[PDB]
Amino acid sequence: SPGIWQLDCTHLEGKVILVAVHVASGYIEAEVIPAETGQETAYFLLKLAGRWPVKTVHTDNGSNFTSTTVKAACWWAGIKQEDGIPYNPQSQGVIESMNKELKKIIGQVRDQAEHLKTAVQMAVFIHNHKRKGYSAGERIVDIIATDIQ
């Protein structure tokens, strides 16, 4: 549980927003990329795993599951690369709702930045700090620290 992440790709403004969600906490990281290539996904995972103890990644689609560049990054960073099949149907709904929430936040901040990438990072900030009462940022640190101890 502490090491499980899910990839998620959503679109806005003719660009791609790549998201990684820490499943147990709902904490996220995200980036804007021109398109979702194996190379972009691989680089994103490399960044993520240098920052958090990523044990397992559920890939967002079959192309990223198949990609030898993505597999190479998972090999490099010591990540178990897994599919993203929603054996629990609740997963679909959670990701859908998260994408809707994120796009809402991006709209609320969109005029505070020229570039979409800035707006996305503002949305990451708001999402991770929002008290649901703990925030996702508090939950991920608590979950991981408890695991360490």
Ligand X SMILES: C=CCN(Cc1ccccc1C(=O)NCc1ccco1)Cc1ccc2c(c1C(=O)O)OC[C@H](CCC(=O)O)O2
List residues binding ligand X (CB under 6 A): 37, 39-40, 42-43, 46, 69, 72-73, 76, 112-115, 117-118
- Which of these segments, 10-18, 85-93, 98-106, 118-126, binds a copy of itself (CB under 8 A)? 118-126
Nearest-Å Rg of the Cα atoms of the chain is: 15
Name which of 81 and 91 has its Cβ closer to ligand X. Answer: 81
Residues in a beta bridge with 57: 5, 81
14: helix, strand or coil = coil
The torsion defined by the Cα of 95, 100, 105 and 110, in degrees rounded to 10, comes to: 120
What is the CB neighbour count within 10 angstroms for residue 112?
A: 9
- Shortest gap between Cβ of 5 and a copy of itself (angstroms)? 14
- Shortest gap between Cβ of 121 and ligand X (angstroms)? 8
Residue with the CB atom nearest Cl ion in the bound state = 137
